[PDB]
PDB file of all heavy atoms in Angstrom:
ATOM      1  N   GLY A 135     189.551 141.021 -71.168  1.00  0.00           N
ATOM      2  CA  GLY A 135     188.275 141.101 -70.481  1.00  0.00           C
ATOM      3  C   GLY A 135     188.247 140.111 -69.327  1.00  0.00           C
ATOM      4  O   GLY A 135     187.351 140.161 -68.501  1.00  0.00           O
ATOM      5  N   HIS A 136     189.235 139.219 -69.265  1.00  0.00           N
ATOM      6  CA  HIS A 136     189.227 138.249 -68.162  1.00  0.00           C
ATOM      7  C   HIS A 136     187.990 137.379 -68.082  1.00  0.00           C
ATOM      8  O   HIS A 136     187.393 137.259 -67.006  1.00  0.00           O
ATOM      9  CB  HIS A 136     189.412 138.957 -66.822  1.00  0.00           C
ATOM     10  CG  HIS A 136     190.835 139.308 -66.530  1.00  0.00           C
ATOM     11  ND1 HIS A 136     191.766 138.367 -66.147  1.00  0.00           N
ATOM     12  CD2 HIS A 136     191.510 140.473 -66.664  1.00  0.00           C
ATOM     13  CE1 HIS A 136     192.955 138.934 -66.065  1.00  0.00           C
ATOM     14  NE2 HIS A 136     192.827 140.212 -66.375  1.00  0.00           N
ATOM     15  N   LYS A 137     187.610 136.752 -69.189  1.00  0.00           N
ATOM     16  CA  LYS A 137     186.411 135.926 -69.115  1.00  0.00           C
ATOM     17  C   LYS A 137     186.786 134.447 -69.051  1.00  0.00           C
ATOM     18  O   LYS A 137     185.916 133.579 -69.136  1.00  0.00           O
ATOM     19  CB  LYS A 137     185.545 136.168 -70.350  1.00  0.00           C
ATOM     20  CG  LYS A 137     185.125 137.618 -70.570  1.00  0.00           C
ATOM     21  CD  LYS A 137     184.465 137.747 -71.946  1.00  0.00           C
ATOM     22  CE  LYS A 137     184.216 139.194 -72.381  1.00  0.00           C
ATOM     23  NZ  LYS A 137     183.122 139.887 -71.632  1.00  0.00           N
ATOM     24  N   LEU A 138     188.069 134.141 -68.897  1.00  0.00           N
ATOM     25  CA  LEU A 138     188.396 132.721 -68.891  1.00  0.00           C
ATOM     26  C   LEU A 138     188.250 132.051 -67.526  1.00  0.00           C
ATOM     27  O   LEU A 138     188.662 132.618 -66.503  1.00  0.00           O
ATOM     28  CB  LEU A 138     189.809 132.516 -69.461  1.00  0.00           C
ATOM     29  CG  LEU A 138     190.042 132.994 -70.909  1.00  0.00           C
ATOM     30  CD1 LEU A 138     191.506 132.869 -71.296  1.00  0.00           C
ATOM     31  CD2 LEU A 138     189.182 132.192 -71.853  1.00  0.00           C
ATOM     32  N   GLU A 139     187.656 130.854 -67.507  1.00  0.00           N
ATOM     33  CA  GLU A 139     187.496 130.165 -66.227  1.00  0.00           C
ATOM     34  C   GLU A 139     188.839 129.649 -65.714  1.00  0.00           C
ATOM     35  O   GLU A 139     189.739 129.356 -66.510  1.00  0.00           O
ATOM     36  CB  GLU A 139     186.537 128.984 -66.361  1.00  0.00           C
ATOM     37  CG  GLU A 139     185.145 129.358 -66.747  1.00  0.00           C
ATOM     38  CD  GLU A 139     184.231 128.158 -66.798  1.00  0.00           C
ATOM     39  OE1 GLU A 139     184.646 127.116 -67.342  1.00  0.00           O
ATOM     40  OE2 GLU A 139     183.085 128.266 -66.295  1.00  0.00           O
ATOM     41  N   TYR A 140     188.959 129.526 -64.392  1.00  0.00           N
ATOM     42  CA  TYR A 140     190.204 129.057 -63.792  1.00  0.00           C
ATOM     43  C   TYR A 140     190.274 127.544 -63.794  1.00  0.00           C
ATOM     44  O   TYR A 140     190.040 126.919 -62.767  1.00  0.00           O
ATOM     45  CB  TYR A 140     190.283 129.553 -62.351  1.00  0.00           C
ATOM     46  CG  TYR A 140     191.626 129.381 -61.689  1.00  0.00           C
ATOM     47  CD1 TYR A 140     192.730 130.102 -62.129  1.00  0.00           C
ATOM     48  CD2 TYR A 140     191.794 128.498 -60.623  1.00  0.00           C
ATOM     49  CE1 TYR A 140     193.973 129.951 -61.530  1.00  0.00           C
ATOM     50  CE2 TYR A 140     193.037 128.335 -60.010  1.00  0.00           C
ATOM     51  CZ  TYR A 140     194.122 129.064 -60.472  1.00  0.00           C
ATOM     52  OH  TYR A 140     195.356 128.887 -59.889  1.00  0.00           O
ATOM     53  N   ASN A 141     190.597 126.944 -64.928  1.00  0.00           N
ATOM     54  CA  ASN A 141     190.658 125.492 -64.903  1.00  0.00           C
ATOM     55  C   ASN A 141     191.368 125.078 -66.186  1.00  0.00           C
ATOM     56  O   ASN A 141     191.162 125.709 -67.231  1.00  0.00           O
ATOM     57  CB  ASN A 141     189.244 124.922 -64.867  1.00  0.00           C
ATOM     58  CG  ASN A 141     188.470 125.217 -66.133  1.00  0.00           C
ATOM     59  OD1 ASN A 141     188.725 124.616 -67.172  1.00  0.00           O
ATOM     60  ND2 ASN A 141     187.533 126.151 -66.061  1.00  0.00           N
ATOM     61  N   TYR A 142     192.202 124.045 -66.137  1.00  0.00           N
ATOM     62  CA  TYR A 142     192.878 123.691 -67.383  1.00  0.00           C
ATOM     63  C   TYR A 142     192.294 122.419 -67.983  1.00  0.00           C
ATOM     64  O   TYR A 142     191.447 121.785 -67.365  1.00  0.00           O
ATOM     65  CB  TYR A 142     194.376 123.493 -67.127  1.00  0.00           C
ATOM     66  CG  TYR A 142     195.259 124.086 -68.190  1.00  0.00           C
ATOM     67  CD1 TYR A 142     195.394 125.460 -68.306  1.00  0.00           C
ATOM     68  CD2 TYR A 142     195.940 123.276 -69.096  1.00  0.00           C
ATOM     69  CE1 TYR A 142     196.183 126.022 -69.299  1.00  0.00           C
ATOM     70  CE2 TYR A 142     196.738 123.833 -70.102  1.00  0.00           C
ATOM     71  CZ  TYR A 142     196.851 125.209 -70.193  1.00  0.00           C
ATOM     72  OH  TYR A 142     197.617 125.801 -71.166  1.00  0.00           O
ATOM     73  N   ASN A 143     192.724 122.050 -69.187  1.00  0.00           N
ATOM     74  CA  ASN A 143     192.181 120.817 -69.770  1.00  0.00           C
ATOM     75  C   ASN A 143     193.308 119.852 -70.094  1.00  0.00           C
ATOM     76  O   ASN A 143     194.408 119.989 -69.565  1.00  0.00           O
ATOM     77  CB  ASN A 143     191.421 121.113 -71.065  1.00  0.00           C
ATOM     78  CG  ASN A 143     190.028 121.623 -70.824  1.00  0.00           C
ATOM     79  OD1 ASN A 143     189.161 120.892 -70.364  1.00  0.00           O
ATOM     80  ND2 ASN A 143     189.805 122.885 -71.137  1.00  0.00           N
ATOM     81  N   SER A 144     193.047 118.881 -70.962  1.00  0.00           N
ATOM     82  CA  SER A 144     194.126 117.964 -71.274  1.00  0.00           C
ATOM     83  C   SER A 144     194.457 118.125 -72.734  1.00  0.00           C
ATOM     84  O   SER A 144     193.544 118.203 -73.551  1.00  0.00           O
ATOM     85  CB  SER A 144     193.678 116.541 -71.016  1.00  0.00           C
ATOM     86  OG  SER A 144     193.116 116.441 -69.727  1.00  0.00           O
ATOM     87  N   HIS A 145     195.732 118.169 -73.097  1.00  0.00           N
ATOM     88  CA  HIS A 145     195.941 118.341 -74.528  1.00  0.00           C
ATOM     89  C   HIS A 145     197.048 117.453 -75.048  1.00  0.00           C
ATOM     90  O   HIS A 145     197.893 117.004 -74.267  1.00  0.00           O
ATOM     91  CB  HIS A 145     196.292 119.792 -74.848  1.00  0.00           C
ATOM     92  CG  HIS A 145     195.412 120.795 -74.168  1.00  0.00           C
ATOM     93  ND1 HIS A 145     195.637 121.225 -72.881  1.00  0.00           N
ATOM     94  CD2 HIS A 145     194.304 121.445 -74.594  1.00  0.00           C
ATOM     95  CE1 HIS A 145     194.708 122.101 -72.543  1.00  0.00           C
ATOM     96  NE2 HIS A 145     193.886 122.252 -73.566  1.00  0.00           N
ATOM     97  N   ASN A 146     197.052 117.190 -76.354  1.00  0.00           N
ATOM     98  CA  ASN A 146     198.143 116.365 -76.863  1.00  0.00           C
ATOM     99  C   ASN A 146     199.209 117.204 -77.510  1.00  0.00           C
ATOM    100  O   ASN A 146     198.923 117.942 -78.464  1.00  0.00           O
ATOM    101  CB  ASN A 146     197.655 115.353 -77.880  1.00  0.00           C
ATOM    102  CG  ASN A 146     197.014 114.194 -77.238  1.00  0.00           C
ATOM    103  OD1 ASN A 146     196.027 114.349 -76.523  1.00  0.00           O
ATOM    104  ND2 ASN A 146     197.572 113.013 -77.459  1.00  0.00           N
ATOM    105  N   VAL A 147     200.433 117.078 -76.996  1.00  0.00           N
ATOM    106  CA  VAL A 147     201.529 117.859 -77.558  1.00  0.00           C
ATOM    107  C   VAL A 147     202.225 117.046 -78.642  1.00  0.00           C
ATOM    108  O   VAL A 147     202.884 116.051 -78.345  1.00  0.00           O
ATOM    109  CB  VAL A 147     202.547 118.239 -76.453  1.00  0.00           C
ATOM    110  CG1 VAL A 147     203.634 119.110 -77.021  1.00  0.00           C
ATOM    111  CG2 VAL A 147     201.827 118.949 -75.312  1.00  0.00           C
ATOM    112  N   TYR A 148     202.082 117.465 -79.894  1.00  0.00           N
ATOM    113  CA  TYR A 148     202.732 116.700 -80.947  1.00  0.00           C
ATOM    114  C   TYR A 148     204.146 117.194 -81.218  1.00  0.00           C
ATOM    115  O   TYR A 148     204.387 118.400 -81.304  1.00  0.00           O
ATOM    116  CB  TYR A 148     201.852 116.746 -82.200  1.00  0.00           C
ATOM    117  CG  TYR A 148     200.513 116.082 -81.957  1.00  0.00           C
ATOM    118  CD1 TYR A 148     199.361 116.839 -81.746  1.00  0.00           C
ATOM    119  CD2 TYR A 148     200.417 114.693 -81.848  1.00  0.00           C
ATOM    120  CE1 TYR A 148     198.150 116.225 -81.423  1.00  0.00           C
ATOM    121  CE2 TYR A 148     199.218 114.074 -81.528  1.00  0.00           C
ATOM    122  CZ  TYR A 148     198.088 114.845 -81.314  1.00  0.00           C
ATOM    123  OH  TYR A 148     196.899 114.244 -80.957  1.00  0.00           O
ATOM    124  N   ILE A 149     205.085 116.265 -81.341  1.00  0.00           N
ATOM    125  CA  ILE A 149     206.449 116.714 -81.558  1.00  0.00           C
ATOM    126  C   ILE A 149     207.053 116.049 -82.771  1.00  0.00           C
ATOM    127  O   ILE A 149     206.826 114.854 -83.003  1.00  0.00           O
ATOM    128  CB  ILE A 149     207.333 116.368 -80.362  1.00  0.00           C
ATOM    129  CG1 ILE A 149     206.811 117.085 -79.125  1.00  0.00           C
ATOM    130  CG2 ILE A 149     208.777 116.732 -80.648  1.00  0.00           C
ATOM    131  CD1 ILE A 149     207.422 116.585 -77.861  1.00  0.00           C
ATOM    132  N   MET A 150     207.820 116.814 -83.543  1.00  0.00           N
ATOM    133  CA  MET A 150     208.433 116.212 -84.717  1.00  0.00           C
ATOM    134  C   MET A 150     209.869 116.725 -84.850  1.00  0.00           C
ATOM    135  O   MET A 150     210.167 117.831 -84.386  1.00  0.00           O
ATOM    136  CB  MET A 150     207.604 116.532 -85.958  1.00  0.00           C
ATOM    137  CG  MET A 150     207.226 117.986 -86.098  1.00  0.00           C
ATOM    138  SD  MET A 150     205.669 118.149 -87.016  1.00  0.00           S
ATOM    139  CE  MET A 150     204.454 117.904 -85.677  1.00  0.00           C
ATOM    140  N   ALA A 151     210.741 115.931 -85.484  1.00  0.00           N
ATOM    141  CA  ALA A 151     212.147 116.330 -85.588  1.00  0.00           C
ATOM    142  C   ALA A 151     212.516 117.446 -86.562  1.00  0.00           C
ATOM    143  O   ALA A 151     211.838 117.671 -87.563  1.00  0.00           O
ATOM    144  CB  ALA A 151     212.992 115.109 -85.889  1.00  0.00           C
ATOM    145  N   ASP A 152     213.604 118.145 -86.276  1.00  0.00           N
ATOM    146  CA  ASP A 152     213.986 119.192 -87.211  1.00  0.00           C
ATOM    147  C   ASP A 152     215.490 119.024 -87.427  1.00  0.00           C
ATOM    148  O   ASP A 152     216.294 119.854 -86.990  1.00  0.00           O
ATOM    149  CB  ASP A 152     213.654 120.557 -86.601  1.00  0.00           C
ATOM    150  CG  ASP A 152     213.846 121.702 -87.575  1.00  0.00           C
ATOM    151  OD1 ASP A 152     213.740 121.484 -88.802  1.00  0.00           O
ATOM    152  OD2 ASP A 152     214.094 122.832 -87.103  1.00  0.00           O
ATOM    153  N   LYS A 153     215.865 117.934 -88.084  1.00  0.00           N
ATOM    154  CA  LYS A 153     217.285 117.693 -88.305  1.00  0.00           C
ATOM    155  C   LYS A 153     218.034 118.909 -88.841  1.00  0.00           C
ATOM    156  O   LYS A 153     219.174 119.155 -88.445  1.00  0.00           O
ATOM    157  CB  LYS A 153     217.448 116.510 -89.266  1.00  0.00           C
ATOM    158  CG  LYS A 153     216.781 115.221 -88.772  1.00  0.00           C
ATOM    159  CD  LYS A 153     216.754 114.155 -89.861  1.00  0.00           C
ATOM    160  CE  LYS A 153     216.251 112.808 -89.347  1.00  0.00           C
ATOM    161  NZ  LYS A 153     214.913 112.875 -88.701  1.00  0.00           N
ATOM    162  N   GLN A 154     217.409 119.678 -89.726  1.00  0.00           N
ATOM    163  CA  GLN A 154     218.141 120.833 -90.231  1.00  0.00           C
ATOM    164  C   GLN A 154     218.520 121.795 -89.117  1.00  0.00           C
ATOM    165  O   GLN A 154     219.543 122.472 -89.209  1.00  0.00           O
ATOM    166  CB  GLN A 154     217.298 121.552 -91.271  1.00  0.00           C
ATOM    167  CG  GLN A 154     215.869 121.738 -90.825  1.00  0.00           C
ATOM    168  CD  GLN A 154     214.997 122.247 -91.943  1.00  0.00           C
ATOM    169  OE1 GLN A 154     215.203 123.355 -92.452  1.00  0.00           O
ATOM    170  NE2 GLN A 154     214.018 121.439 -92.344  1.00  0.00           N
ATOM    171  N   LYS A 155     217.722 121.875 -88.061  1.00  0.00           N
ATOM    172  CA  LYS A 155     218.165 122.805 -87.037  1.00  0.00           C
ATOM    173  C   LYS A 155     218.666 122.059 -85.804  1.00  0.00           C
ATOM    174  O   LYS A 155     219.008 122.698 -84.801  1.00  0.00           O
ATOM    175  CB  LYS A 155     217.034 123.759 -86.675  1.00  0.00           C
ATOM    176  CG  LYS A 155     216.546 124.604 -87.843  1.00  0.00           C
ATOM    177  CD  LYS A 155     215.573 125.646 -87.343  1.00  0.00           C
ATOM    178  CE  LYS A 155     215.151 126.610 -88.429  1.00  0.00           C
ATOM    179  NZ  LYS A 155     214.322 127.706 -87.845  1.00  0.00           N
ATOM    180  N   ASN A 156     218.728 120.724 -85.896  1.00  0.00           N
ATOM    181  CA  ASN A 156     219.196 119.913 -84.762  1.00  0.00           C
ATOM    182  C   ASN A 156     218.250 120.173 -83.587  1.00  0.00           C
ATOM    183  O   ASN A 156     218.634 120.057 -82.423  1.00  0.00           O
ATOM    184  CB  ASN A 156     220.651 120.275 -84.409  1.00  0.00           C
ATOM    185  CG  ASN A 156     221.360 119.200 -83.557  1.00  0.00           C
ATOM    186  OD1 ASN A 156     221.592 118.068 -83.997  1.00  0.00           O
ATOM    187  ND2 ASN A 156     221.729 119.579 -82.331  1.00  0.00           N
ATOM    188  N   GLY A 157     217.006 120.518 -83.890  1.00  0.00           N
ATOM    189  CA  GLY A 157     216.063 120.784 -82.838  1.00  0.00           C
ATOM    190  C   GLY A 157     214.725 120.128 -83.086  1.00  0.00           C
ATOM    191  O   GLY A 157     214.620 119.105 -83.774  1.00  0.00           O
ATOM    192  N   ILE A 158     213.693 120.738 -82.506  1.00  0.00           N
ATOM    193  CA  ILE A 158     212.386 120.149 -82.702  1.00  0.00           C
ATOM    194  C   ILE A 158     211.292 121.145 -83.055  1.00  0.00           C
ATOM    195  O   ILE A 158     211.420 122.350 -82.814  1.00  0.00           O
ATOM    196  CB  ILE A 158     211.917 119.388 -81.456  1.00  0.00           C
ATOM    197  CG1 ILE A 158     211.848 120.352 -80.262  1.00  0.00           C
ATOM    198  CG2 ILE A 158     212.817 118.189 -81.210  1.00  0.00           C
ATOM    199  CD1 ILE A 158     211.101 119.809 -79.056  1.00  0.00           C
ATOM    200  N   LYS A 159     210.222 120.612 -83.641  1.00  0.00           N
ATOM    201  CA  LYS A 159     209.090 121.447 -83.995  1.00  0.00           C
ATOM    202  C   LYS A 159     207.921 120.882 -83.191  1.00  0.00           C
ATOM    203  O   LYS A 159     207.613 119.692 -83.294  1.00  0.00           O
ATOM    204  CB  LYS A 159     208.808 121.356 -85.503  1.00  0.00           C
ATOM    205  CG  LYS A 159     209.703 122.234 -86.399  1.00  0.00           C
ATOM    206  CD  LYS A 159     209.422 123.746 -86.202  1.00  0.00           C
ATOM    207  CE  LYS A 159     210.237 124.651 -87.164  1.00  0.00           C
ATOM    208  NZ  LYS A 159     210.131 124.308 -88.617  1.00  0.00           N
ATOM    209  N   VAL A 160     207.286 121.706 -82.371  1.00  0.00           N
ATOM    210  CA  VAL A 160     206.182 121.127 -81.627  1.00  0.00           C
ATOM    211  C   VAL A 160     204.953 121.958 -81.886  1.00  0.00           C
ATOM    212  O   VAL A 160     205.025 123.182 -81.803  1.00  0.00           O
ATOM    213  CB  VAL A 160     206.435 121.165 -80.122  1.00  0.00           C
ATOM    214  CG1 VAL A 160     205.409 120.296 -79.424  1.00  0.00           C
ATOM    215  CG2 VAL A 160     207.857 120.712 -79.819  1.00  0.00           C
ATOM    216  N   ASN A 161     203.826 121.329 -82.183  1.00  0.00           N
ATOM    217  CA  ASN A 161     202.646 122.157 -82.426  1.00  0.00           C
ATOM    218  C   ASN A 161     201.410 121.528 -81.809  1.00  0.00           C
ATOM    219  O   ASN A 161     201.135 120.360 -82.049  1.00  0.00           O
ATOM    220  CB  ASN A 161     202.424 122.359 -83.926  1.00  0.00           C
ATOM    221  CG  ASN A 161     202.753 121.118 -84.728  1.00  0.00           C
ATOM    222  OD1 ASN A 161     203.925 120.870 -85.079  1.00  0.00           O
ATOM    223  ND2 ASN A 161     201.726 120.302 -84.997  1.00  0.00           N
ATOM    224  N   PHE A 162     200.675 122.300 -81.010  1.00  0.00           N
ATOM    225  CA  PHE A 162     199.481 121.742 -80.379  1.00  0.00           C
ATOM    226  C   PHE A 162     198.382 122.779 -80.220  1.00  0.00           C
ATOM    227  O   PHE A 162     198.555 123.939 -80.593  1.00  0.00           O
ATOM    228  CB  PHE A 162     199.828 121.155 -79.015  1.00  0.00           C
ATOM    229  CG  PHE A 162     200.691 122.051 -78.176  1.00  0.00           C
ATOM    230  CD1 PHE A 162     200.171 122.697 -77.063  1.00  0.00           C
ATOM    231  CD2 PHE A 162     202.036 122.236 -78.482  1.00  0.00           C
ATOM    232  CE1 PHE A 162     200.977 123.510 -76.263  1.00  0.00           C
ATOM    233  CE2 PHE A 162     202.847 123.045 -77.694  1.00  0.00           C
ATOM    234  CZ  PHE A 162     202.318 123.682 -76.581  1.00  0.00           C
ATOM    235  N   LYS A 163     197.258 122.378 -79.647  1.00  0.00           N
ATOM    236  CA  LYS A 163     196.188 123.357 -79.520  1.00  0.00           C
ATOM    237  C   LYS A 163     195.720 123.382 -78.078  1.00  0.00           C
ATOM    238  O   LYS A 163     195.563 122.322 -77.487  1.00  0.00           O
ATOM    239  CB  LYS A 163     195.026 122.939 -80.416  1.00  0.00           C
ATOM    240  CG  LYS A 163     194.000 123.999 -80.667  1.00  0.00           C
ATOM    241  CD  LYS A 163     194.366 124.813 -81.888  1.00  0.00           C
ATOM    242  CE  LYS A 163     193.958 124.080 -83.155  1.00  0.00           C
ATOM    243  NZ  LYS A 163     194.672 122.792 -83.265  1.00  0.00           N
ATOM    244  N   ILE A 164     195.503 124.556 -77.499  1.00  0.00           N
ATOM    245  CA  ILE A 164     195.022 124.533 -76.115  1.00  0.00           C
ATOM    246  C   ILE A 164     193.584 125.017 -76.096  1.00  0.00           C
ATOM    247  O   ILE A 164     193.264 125.986 -76.775  1.00  0.00           O
ATOM    248  CB  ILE A 164     195.834 125.472 -75.197  1.00  0.00           C
ATOM    249  CG1 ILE A 164     197.228 124.901 -74.960  1.00  0.00           C
ATOM    250  CG2 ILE A 164     195.105 125.654 -73.881  1.00  0.00           C
ATOM    251  CD1 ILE A 164     197.221 123.585 -74.216  1.00  0.00           C
ATOM    252  N   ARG A 165     192.711 124.371 -75.334  1.00  0.00           N
ATOM    253  CA  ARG A 165     191.351 124.896 -75.362  1.00  0.00           C
ATOM    254  C   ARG A 165     191.032 125.557 -74.028  1.00  0.00           C
ATOM    255  O   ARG A 165     191.103 124.905 -72.984  1.00  0.00           O
ATOM    256  CB  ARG A 165     190.350 123.775 -75.636  1.00  0.00           C
ATOM    257  CG  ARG A 165     190.739 122.858 -76.787  1.00  0.00           C
ATOM    258  CD  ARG A 165     189.593 121.942 -77.155  1.00  0.00           C
ATOM    259  NE  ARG A 165     188.568 122.640 -77.928  1.00  0.00           N
ATOM    260  CZ  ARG A 165     187.301 122.244 -78.036  1.00  0.00           C
ATOM    261  NH1 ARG A 165     186.881 121.149 -77.415  1.00  0.00           N
ATOM    262  NH2 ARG A 165     186.448 122.943 -78.775  1.00  0.00           N
TER     263      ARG A 165
END
């Protein structure tokens, strides 16, 4: 429906290790 305003906010990107995959898991929320 295109009802979102054209403007972004500030968010915290949390990151945690994933030794089993030699990578990372990142999870955050965007408003």
Side-chain angles (χ1 to χ4, degrees):
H136 280 285
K137 303 171 190 288
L138 300 174
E139 297 183 316
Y140 192 67
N141 66 74
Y142 222 71
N143 280 291
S144 309
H145 314 84
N146 281 60
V147 183
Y148 297 103
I149 298 168
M150 48 208 84
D152 188 27
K153 302 170 173 55
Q154 46 189 297
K155 299 188 174 187
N156 198 65
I158 60 167
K159 279 292 184 53
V160 192
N161 37 276
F162 46 108
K163 195 89 81 298
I164 289 296
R165 313 190 77 202

